[PDB]
Design an enzyme around this catalytic site. Sequence first.
Site, PDB file in Angstrom:
ATOM      1  N   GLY A 119     -10.728 -21.670  23.826  1.00  0.00           N
ATOM      2  CA  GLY A 119     -10.326 -23.472  23.813  1.00  0.00           C
ATOM      3  C   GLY A 119     -10.534 -24.191  22.296  1.00  0.00           C
TER       4      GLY A 119
ATOM      5  N   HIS B  42      -1.503 -18.799  16.395  1.00  0.00           N
ATOM      6  CA  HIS B  42      -1.066 -17.706  17.562  1.00  0.00           C
ATOM      7  C   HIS B  42      -1.067 -18.896  18.697  1.00  0.00           C
ATOM      8  CE1 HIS B  42      -5.387 -18.859  19.109  1.00  0.00           C
ATOM      9  NE2 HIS B  42      -5.118 -18.417  17.697  1.00  0.00           N
TER      10      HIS B  42
ATOM     11  N   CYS C  20     -10.004 -23.127  19.484  1.00  0.00           N
ATOM     12  CA  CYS C  20      -9.777 -22.699  18.344  1.00  0.00           C
ATOM     13  C   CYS C  20      -8.818 -23.685  17.718  1.00  0.00           C
ATOM     14  CB  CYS C  20      -8.597 -21.693  18.238  1.00  0.00           C
ATOM     15  SG  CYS C  20      -9.188 -19.513  19.046  1.00  0.00           S
TER      16      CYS C  20
HETATM   17  C1  LIG Z   1      -4.361 -14.091  24.637  1.00  0.00           C
HETATM   18  N1  LIG Z   1      -3.863 -15.623  23.567  1.00  0.00           N
HETATM   19  C2  LIG Z   1      -2.098 -15.553  23.829  1.00  0.00           C
HETATM   20  C3  LIG Z   1      -4.623 -16.360  23.798  1.00  0.00           C
HETATM   21  C4  LIG Z   1      -6.053 -16.200  23.232  1.00  0.00           C
HETATM   22  O1  LIG Z   1      -7.149 -16.693  23.954  1.00  0.00           O
HETATM   23  N2  LIG Z   1      -6.477 -16.147  22.330  1.00  0.00           N
HETATM   24  C5  LIG Z   1      -7.564 -16.247  21.521  1.00  0.00           C
HETATM   25  C6  LIG Z   1      -8.516 -15.158  21.476  1.00  0.00           C
HETATM   26  C7  LIG Z   1     -10.037 -15.284  20.710  1.00  0.00           C
HETATM   27  O2  LIG Z   1     -10.655 -15.268  19.599  1.00  0.00           O
HETATM   28  N3  LIG Z   1     -10.451 -16.678  21.282  1.00  0.00           N
HETATM   29  C8  LIG Z   1     -11.301 -16.874  20.910  1.00  0.00           C
HETATM   30  C9  LIG Z   1     -11.945 -17.847  19.769  1.00  0.00           C
HETATM   31  N4  LIG Z   1     -13.480 -18.665  19.782  1.00  0.00           N
HETATM   32  C10 LIG Z   1     -14.466 -18.083  21.114  1.00  0.00           C
HETATM   33  C11 LIG Z   1     -14.239 -17.735  22.179  1.00  0.00           C
HETATM   34  C12 LIG Z   1     -15.574 -16.599  22.442  1.00  0.00           C
HETATM   35  C13 LIG Z   1     -14.809 -16.373  23.553  1.00  0.00           C
HETATM   36  C14 LIG Z   1     -13.394 -15.709  24.306  1.00  0.00           C
HETATM   37  C15 LIG Z   1     -12.402 -16.416  23.339  1.00  0.00           C
HETATM   38  C16 LIG Z   1     -12.228 -17.220  21.963  1.00  0.00           C
HETATM   39  C17 LIG Z   1      -9.028 -14.345  22.661  1.00  0.00           C
HETATM   40  C18 LIG Z   1      -8.933 -12.976  22.021  1.00  0.00           C
HETATM   41  O3  LIG Z   1      -8.379 -12.219  21.366  1.00  0.00           O
HETATM   42  C19 LIG Z   1      -7.970 -13.164  19.722  1.00  0.00           C
HETATM   43  C20 LIG Z   1      -7.561 -11.839  19.429  1.00  0.00           C
HETATM   44  C21 LIG Z   1      -6.749 -12.870  17.949  1.00  0.00           C
HETATM   45  C22 LIG Z   1      -7.163 -13.978  17.878  1.00  0.00           C
HETATM   46 CL1  LIG Z   1      -6.360 -14.164  16.503  1.00  0.00          CL
HETATM   47  C23 LIG Z   1      -7.445 -15.036  18.817  1.00  0.00           C
HETATM   48  C24 LIG Z   1      -7.505 -14.114  20.010  1.00  0.00           C
END
Ligand SMILES: CN(C)CC(=O)NC[C@@]1(C(=O)Nc2cncc3ccccc23)CCOc2ccc(Cl)cc21
Lengths: 301, 305
Positions: free
Chosen positions: B143, B41, B145
């Site tokens: 951040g 992603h 991921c």
């Molecule tokens: C929007 N994208 C381009 C960037 C992004 O931030 N993508 C990462 C994202 C995600 O889950 N991020 C996070 C991971 N761990 C902890 C977190 C704590 C707080 C906020 C976000 C967190 C954002 C939400 O939606 C999805 C949905 C599917 C997937 Cl596989 C990833 C994601």
Amino acid sequence: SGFRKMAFPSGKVEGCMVQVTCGTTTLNGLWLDDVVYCPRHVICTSEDMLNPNYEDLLIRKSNHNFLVQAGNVQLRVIGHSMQNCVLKLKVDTANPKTPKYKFVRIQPGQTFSVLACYNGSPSGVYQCAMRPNFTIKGSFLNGSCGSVGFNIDYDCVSFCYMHHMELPTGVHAGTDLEGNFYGPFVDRQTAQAAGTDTTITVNVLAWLYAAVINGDRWFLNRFTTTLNDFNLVAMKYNYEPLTQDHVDILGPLSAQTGIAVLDMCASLKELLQNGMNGRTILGSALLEDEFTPFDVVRQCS
Amino acid sequence: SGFRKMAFPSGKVEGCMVQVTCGTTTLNGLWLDDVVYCPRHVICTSEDMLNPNYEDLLIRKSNHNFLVQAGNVQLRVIGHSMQNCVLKLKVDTANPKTPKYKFVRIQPGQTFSVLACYNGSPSGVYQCAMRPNFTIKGSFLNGSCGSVGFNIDYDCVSFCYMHHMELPTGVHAGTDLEGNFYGPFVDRQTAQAAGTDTTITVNVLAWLYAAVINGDRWFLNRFTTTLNDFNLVAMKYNYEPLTQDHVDILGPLSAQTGIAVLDMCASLKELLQNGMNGRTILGSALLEDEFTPFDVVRQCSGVTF
Ligand SMILES: CN(C)CC(=O)NC[C@@]1(C(=O)Nc2cncc3ccccc23)CCOc2ccc(Cl)cc21
Ligand SMILES: CN(C)CC(=O)NC[C@@]1(C(=O)Nc2cncc3ccccc23)CCOc2ccc(Cl)cc21
């Protein structure tokens, strides 16, 4: 989201762990630059555990009596000195993996990561706090002596603890890296006991703020309290007094959640009176006191 | 004495963490040999995440679009490919700090250490369990991921998890290092929810053995139970079924404490039907299920890495 008991990454400390052998005793040493630090009780025999005269025992030692092993490499000891309860073994090689480091003496309530070691090899990393009674509730077996407690500031390791002994209740006592014991403990087998421990109130409040930041609000109430009234209640549950310094420390979390410190104090008083009633806070059925206000801010924001 | 939630020493994995940037997205990568692994992603924009065609998005990317940073050194990407939900960035330099490693897919109930990272820099290490619903109750911010889960066996790092996302309940979802998600999750911004979770029974039993080894015996009773009767009671409290494999793996702890597994099961049955009654076990008022039988043996015997 989520709130875990989190330790610092241990890599910078792993590259400092060595095995120190003196006679039949083997324990861990911390190799920084050209010095290996370890508990001075490594020089003790079975007859020197009750009333050791460390100055007398150390004077009888030569550099070749200390066997220091870093990985599968024996280091050569070229000097030895004692600083309080820590032995300092000067070696002929500077540790190439020496990180940026400082020695810091911490106060009760402070948290730190422990890299538990046996025979100079890291076995695990966990998080703990310096209890108000100056003991730590570690997980240590025989051979763990010399294992260290640390925190990491960006890329700098602040060493704050070196493990020396286990008390009769299973709690642990040790020193800072200058060999000064935390608490009224001595490195002798003479009868020693941890004082009655208390809960680190400022840390419980920080953890309740972490719960609010994570969406857990069930324990909040409409009440506030004076600082004195809170301490009068908290003391009855063996909670540490909350000082104005602690209230000040909680300021940023108070500003972030919109819950005044004394408002959160009233929530804590209610929790102490009622318990949890089958509920949990951040996955715990007990009030957690091993997260400082600094830990909460770091982990949440 | 003492029993702590203990993670593996993270040093071998720290020397593998890098920062991967693709457009406006920055996340973590795992640099092993000449390949950087990270969540696919990283190639998505805001619109893309809603319904991404990763083959189509990846074909439009060039090697120079991926900025990989190892410390203060930029690595050069010389190839890119996708394996399930993981992106593999071939680099010109083999990681000199690459440890002995394997990629392993773990089962629910298995524990592992997570090295939480931001901008390719390790920030913390914690121990957790793959929940029976295939989520992890992690601690991650935006951040994180690309942060990885691992175990160590002797001097070999077994990578078992890579962080991809946070579900609406605050629990986490990710993949193995071959990009296969744990659980029925997909890497897309769409309605997804963790299933009803259950307690890892074999792990609770292991933790009760750890409590006995540490001197906590109040919950022991004179009773035993059949495996079938225990499983009937376990179904009622949303506890995972205890198999004969689990009984066998608890064998060494059973031999060490002198408490047969079905004898400990009768203690667990009573704890479930009656509660703790104001008492704690290893400083906890809840039955802890994130220590496997191997974790308990490793901690109570002092295995090193
Ligand atoms: C929007 N994208 C381009 C960037 C992004 O931030 N993508 C990462 C994202 C995600 O889950 N991020 C996070 C991971 N761990 C902890 C977190 C704590 C707080 C906020 C976000 C967190 C954002 C939400 O939606 C999805 C949905 C599917 C997937 Cl596989 C990833 C994601
Ligand atoms: C080998 N012997 C001559 C010296 C030695 O290693 N002594 C270490 C010792 C000690 O506390 N060791 C331990 C530490 N952490 C966890 C433990 C778990 C189980 C058993 C021992 C443990 C044991 C004797 O009581 C004292 C009293 C003063 C001091 Cl400072 C240390 C010690």
